[PDB]
Structure formats: C-alpha cells, structure tokens
Design a protein around this ligand. Structure first.
Ligand SMILES: OC[C@@H]1O[C@@H](O)[C@H](O)[C@H]1O
Ligand SMILES: [Zn+2]
Length: 772
C-alpha cells in the first residue's frame, strides 16, 4: 500500500494558467546562452571559454550555480515537452561539462573562482567556514549542489547515461575530498550554506544501490539543525530560511533511502524531524500565499510586523523548496499515521503555495522571475530578465514551471488520487487507463474526469474534497453522498471504468478572510484556495525589470505610507460579508464596505496581478480604535516611510545577501542575532562598499545601548571624526548614531570600514544606512 507519483512524460497539461506558465518559462530557458553558463566550468578546468560568463551573481562569486539549475530545468522541461530545442541545449551543456570534467580527470566539475585551490585546502583540513563563505568563496557547497542536482535530473528525467557517470565521478571526487576529515571538521564546514548535498548523495545511493553514498549523505547532514527538529523544537528564529529547507529535504531523503538499512537505526527519527519542520513552518511561519521569511530570514513566529512593513517579503526559492518537501512527506504520510491512505492536508498546502506563490512569481506573458513578494500593502515586485539576472530565484524559477504535472495525481495499486484541479491528460499505464481532467477552475467550480481509454479493471478514484470546499454525476446519473468530515478528505468512487465514462463534480468556493498569523490587525481575502489582491497604482515601479546590478532583485522604488493604502474599517465578519463576486467568467470581486482612504475596490487573483503595486494583506481598524490606529499611521509609520525614501543605501550586517551585495570583507569577525536583529562585529575589521546613487549627507549606524564595544569608522580610508547625534533607545535597547558628514559623499562607490576603537571588538552593528 506504497503511494507513488507519475513522471512528467505521463501528465500532459491542457490549456490553463499552468500551461501558459510552462510555455513562458520554456521561452526564458531557451533565451539563455549555454556558452556563457558553461564558461565558469571550463575556466576552472583550465580550458578556454567560448564566451564570457554572465554578469550579476555569475561573475561575482556564484559562477556556475545557474548552469546547475539550467541542467535541472532543461531535463524536466524535456521530460514534460519533448521540445527539440531544449534537447539541443541539454546535450550541449552536458558535453561541455563532460569536457571540463575530463580535462581535470578526478571527477571535479565546478565554477567557483579558484575551485581547485579551494578543494585542495578543504581536503588538507584548511577549513575557514562562515555562514555564507568557505575559504573566501561565496557558498561553494551550495553552488556545487546545483551541479549534483542537475546531473541527477539529466539522468532521472532525460535518461542520460552520460549524466549518470558524470554524477558518480563527481560524487566519488567528494568522497576523496572528505575522506581525511573528522565529523567535527565536516560539521564545521557545514556552517557554510551547502544547499541539499545530503539529498543528492542519498539520490546517488539509490541510483547505484551503493551504501557508501548513504554514509556520505549522513556525513553531509548538518547536525545542529537536525537534532532539535527530531525533538520537536523550532529554533528557526533569526535563521536564514532557504539555507535550512534543503537540509531538511535531505534528512527526509536519507530516511527514505535508508528505509531498509539494517546497519542504521535512525530513519524514523529523520523522517519525523522533516515532518515537524514542515508542520512548524506551515502552521507558524507562513503567510496566506504559502511562503515564508522576510529579508530571507525567519522572523519570530509571534511577530509578523516586519512581514507587513518590509519590501522584502517571502523569497520564492523557499516555497519551491517547501513544495519539494511537501511532495516527499505526503507520499508516505499513510505509512507514518498507520492509515495506509495519504494525508490530503499536505495537498491543501501544496495547492495554496502552487497557485498563489509559484504561479504568481513569473510574469505570465513576457516571462521574468520574482525573488521577493512583499506583503507590505502598496508595494510591488521585481522580475528577472534572461541576460541580466543570475539570482537563486531565477535558478529555482527555471525549475518551477517545468513540473506542474508532478503533483496533480498519485497512484497506489488500483487507486488513483485526484489531488489538483488542473486541466491535464494522464497516462496511467499501470492500469491501462488514459484520463482527461477538464475544468476552468478556479474561474468555475465544475470538474470533469473523462476516461479516454481503459482495460475494465475495478479502480478507485479518490477525489480530494478540500477543507475549503456530496453530489457527483457519473454518465448523467447523480450519486448523492454524505459528508463523513468537514476536514480535508477523499471521496472514493470505484467502478470498472471504461472508455467514454464521465465523472462530474463541483467544488463550492466561499469568500474567507485570513488574519496574519500573529493576530495583529491585518487580513487577506481568499476565494476558495485563491488569494485575492487589489492593484493600488502603477507609479514609481523602478527597476520592475531588473538590470544586472547587485540588489537588482529588490523593489527599491518609492515607498508609499500605509495611511495612503486602503484600510478596512469594521469588524472581521462584516468585512468578509462586504466582498461581492462580480459576474463574468473570470474571478473578480468588489469590496463594498468602508475603506480609508476611499480610492470602490476591485480584487482579483493575486496570481494575475502583475506590473503594479498591490495589497494582499489589508490593514484593518475597528470603528472604536480608528482614531488611535490612524494617528499611529499618520505620525510614526509616516516618519518610517520618510526615512526609507531618504535612504540612498542600506546594509544589514550579519545578513548574507545584503553583505554579499555590498562586497563584504573582514578579518576576525562574527555575526549573530539579538532581539531579532542581526549584527556583525570584529576584533580585526569588516568593510563594505556603499553604492551611492544620489549624493548622501548622513550616515546612520544602529548599535545596542549597553554594548561597551566601540567602532572607528573609515570612509575611503579616512577616519570619520564627526561626533554623532545619539537617539533615545527604543523598547529593545537599540540606538541610532547619526553622523552628519563633513562633505557630502559624491555619486559612485565608497568603502566603509569598521575597526575596534580601543575595545576588544567593534560595536555590534545592526544596520548601516546612508541618507540624503
Ligand atoms: O546563498 C545562496 C542563496 O542566495 C541567497 O541569498 C538565498 O536566500 C540562498 O539560499
Ligand atoms: Zn532565491
């Protein structure tokens, strides 16, 4: 009673938003130049590139990482479509990386600048690990993971035997690199973000049937993250989120591949840790669109204030990764709970995240991937372009839209699970069945399953009845059936299905009003599983299509004060009831209640809302508390927005991407978190380059009041000797040091360096903000 999935070859998408997203991504993938993506690999192998690498992250230290994702996305797109242009690119990319691999002859393939020197040092036990760095390199373990993954996917999806041997050679190479390292050394190294290496090493174990790769997969499992999760402890506050999710996927994969390993007793524990991780992130750390994190990090689960105020809402990779995890947990959920039927609550999550975040994260006509999806009312999101943008979210973006076929159905001997209501044709070879699902969902409630071919075996269709949603029709005849539960469940329908049979059901959709999880005054409207949003305007959408600059993934355009965005006046039940469905064949709604300030509001599915500012979460105010809530918006929030709109450059020390984007250098430095803000400090020094788009007159530095450590500040190597203005401390003990610069910083770049000022350390610096 094992549940399994269908391959992408056996699930054809029919006309729908999902097929459109697939075709749009197909065009994006084919626009990339494989000579530019291969260039880093060929360079590190001592060969001559046929073209320059791409810029952005591909020439500032993550060189090679898109090439890995590119392999994965081509392979999956190929399995999904058979597209001949796709195969030309895959065959070329693989053969170029093969030449690279053969030129060095040890198994190594890699794009990180100075790769061979790096892995030489590591092998010798010269391990200098930070959060996002290893021996001066930018997350090289994460980088090389995308190659492992890509080669795995070329083998699994496109049947490449060449990819299979390249993968085995590359894995054997890592066994050699790590053979002289102790567990303490491995665990030290793993403090640097390493993607899901443990997952891929477990995949190689399964492909080869050789346990040495399972041993390797466990050695690459980061213990400081795993052990609390085994014990149902969420210690994720302050952690970089997309760093962790692949680790957890890997723990789960190691458990799967270890199911019948007589020499290791830990499979159930590792599975459980993955299951807890999922439960805790979904139930306490996720917003209505299915994603998590603010500025790439987990914020406290009892404080979503940053999620509603910061322009850097959920990162798309994180959701991509949660969906991968969801798929693994669902599959043996019936084994784990003893029912032998999989748990549809996983599918409720998959559906929410697929329609509302994944589908929303690609510009649907031209293409372009989203990195950050703000939940702040009245902001907008930025899209990648093929030749300019080399972000992680481009990489996972390429994969996302290749594989919408993967979770629509699942099969279990003589049972088919119908999980997603996505127009599709299924080839259920195992039971000689071909089936077509037709529906306009979510713009209509009706779903039809048609049997195109069958071999008259008795089969049970398990139709998902989501919590948000019994009369079915079979060949014109109604079969009424009684609700066993209000929870998410399956309706079984068993027949000797034959060609021409037709099953029709309806999914009743209702308006709901979902509060932000910490129960502050913010709510989002849904219709069935679809998050609605309103378009608040189309001005100041700066960089909506990104250039190749560092920080180009961020929507840096003017911030609108929250008091200029519609706030909903009244109590939640009245607000819910004031939303009314407009007629037409596409979902649209008008909000007929009191809105401050008045704009009536039209709401549409967030996944169709593009090239504009929006609100998903609306601020809400009771009639009684209106005066005090509006006054806070009109004074404190208004001033915070003034501050943002005066900011020329902004760095969050201790946060990897802001640091990387400003060319972090350091000696004898550490990072951490305190009162939910990140810091960096050093006994030596740490520096960044400020990007000065407009002339700046002030430098604002945030430190803790009670920190006795002091920093000297150098600006292009000149000591800043001006006396700062010192703010009053906030609730958490933080103060701002405002330096009025003797001369205005001129447009361009300028180094800022922090050194200890007599004390053992610099001050712990929690923010660097340059102001007009
Ligand atoms: O560090 C590599 C990737 O880029 C990051 O900033 C993402 O959040 C992370 O997983
Ligand atoms: Zn990303």
């Amino acid at each position: 009673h094992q549940v399994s999935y269908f391959s992408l070859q056996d699930v054809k998408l029919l006309s729908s938003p999902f097929l459109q997203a697939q075709q749009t991504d197909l065009h994006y993938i084919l626009a990339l130049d494989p000579d530019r993506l291969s260039a880093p690999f060929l360079r590190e192998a001592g060969l001559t590139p046929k073209a320059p690498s791409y810029t952005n992250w591909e020439n500032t230290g993550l060189d090679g990482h898109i090439g890995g994702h590119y392999l994965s996305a081509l392979s999956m797109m190929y399995a999904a479509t058979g597209d001949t242009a796709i195969y030309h690119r895959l065959n070329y990319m693989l053969n170029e990386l093969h030449r690279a691999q053969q030129a060095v002859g040890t198994g190594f393939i890699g794009g990180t600048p100075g790769s061979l020197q790096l892995w030489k040092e590591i092998k010798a036990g010269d391990i200098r690990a930070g959060g996002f760095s290893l021996n001066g390199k930018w997350v090289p373990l994460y980088n090389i993971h995308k190659t492992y993954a890509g080669l795995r996917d070329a083998y699994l999806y496109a049947h490449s035997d060449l990819a299979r041997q390249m993968l085995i050679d590359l894995t054997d190479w890592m066994i050699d690199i790590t053979s002289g390292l102790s567990d303490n050394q491995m665990q030290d190294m793993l403090r640097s973000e390493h993607g899901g290496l443990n997952e891929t090493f477990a995949d190689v174990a399964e492909i080869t049937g050789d346990k040495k790769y399972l041993k390797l997969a466990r050695r690459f499992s980061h213990k400081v993250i795993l052990d609390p999760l085994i014990k149902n402890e969420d210690r994720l506050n302050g952690m970089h989120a997309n760093t962790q999710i692949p680790k957890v996927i890997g723990y789960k994969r190691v458990a799967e591949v270890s199911k019948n390993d007589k020499d290791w007793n830990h499979a159930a524990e590792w599975d459980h840790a993955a299951r807890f991780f999922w439960n805790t992130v979904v139930n306490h750390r996720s917003v209505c669109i299915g994603g998590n994190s603010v500025r790439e990090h987990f914020h406290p689960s009892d404080n979503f204030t940053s999620m509603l105020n910061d322009v850097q809402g959920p990162e798309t990779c994180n959701t991509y990764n949660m969906l991968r995890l969801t798929k693994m947990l669902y599959q043996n959920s019936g084994d784990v709970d003893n029912s032998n039927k999989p748990d549809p609550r996983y599918v409720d999550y998959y559906e929410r995240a697929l329609y509302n975040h994944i589908l929303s994260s690609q510009e649907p006509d031209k293409g372009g991937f989203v990195y950050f999806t703000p939940m702040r009312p009245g902001h907008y999101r930025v899209y990648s372009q093929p030749e300019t943008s080399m972000w992680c979210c481009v990489g996972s973006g390429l994969e996302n839209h290749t594989k919408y076929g993967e979770f629509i159905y699942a099969h279990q001997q003589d049972t088919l699970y119908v999980n997603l209501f996505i127009p599709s044709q299924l080839n259920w070879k195992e039971q000689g069945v071909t089936l077509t699902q037709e529906t306009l969902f979510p713009d209509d409630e009706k779903v039809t399953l048609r049997i195109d071919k069958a071999a008259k075996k008795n089969l049970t269709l398990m139709i998902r009845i989501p919590e948000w949603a019994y009369e079915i029709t079979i060949n014109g005849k109604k079969h009424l059936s009684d609700i066993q539960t209000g929870a998410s469940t399956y309706l079984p329908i068993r027949r000797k299905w034959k060609k021409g049979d037709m099953i029709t059901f309806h999914l009743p959709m209702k308006v709901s009003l979902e509060q932000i999880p910490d129960k502050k005054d913010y709510y989002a409207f849904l219709y069935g599983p679809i998050v609605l949003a309103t378009s608040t305007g189309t001005e100041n959408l700066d960089g909506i299509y990104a250039d190749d600059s560092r920080g180009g993934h961020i929507a840096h355009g003017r911030q609108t004060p929250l008091q200029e965005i519609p706030m909903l006046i009244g109590n939640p039940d009245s607000i819910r009831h004031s939303l009314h469905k407009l007629s037409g064949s596409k979902l649209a709604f008008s909000y007929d209640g009191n809105v401050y300030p008045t704009q009536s509001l039209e709401l549409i599915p967030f996944f169709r809302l593009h090239n504009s500012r929006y609100a998903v979460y609306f601020r809400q105010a009771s009639e009684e508390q209106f005066k005090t809530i509006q006054e806070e918006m009109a004074t404190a929030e208004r001033k915070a927005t003034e501050l943002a709109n005066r900011t020329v450059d902004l760095i969050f020390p201790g946060e990897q991407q802001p640091e990387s984007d400003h060319s972090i250098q350091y000696e004898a430095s550490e990072t951490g978190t305190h009162k939910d803000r990140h810091f960096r400090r050093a006994k030596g020094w740490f520096s960044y380059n400020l990007k000065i788009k407009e002339e700046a007159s002030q430098l604002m530095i945030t430190v803790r009041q009670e920190d006795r450590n002091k920093a000297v500040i150098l600006l292009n190597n000149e000591k800043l000797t001006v006396h700062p203005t010192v703010s009053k401390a906030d609730k958490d003990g933080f103060i701002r040091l405002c330096y009025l610069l003797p001369r205005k910083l001129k447009v361009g770049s300028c180094e800022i360096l922090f050194k200890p000022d007599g004390t053992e350390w610099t001050s712990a610096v929690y923010e660097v903000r340059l102001l007009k």
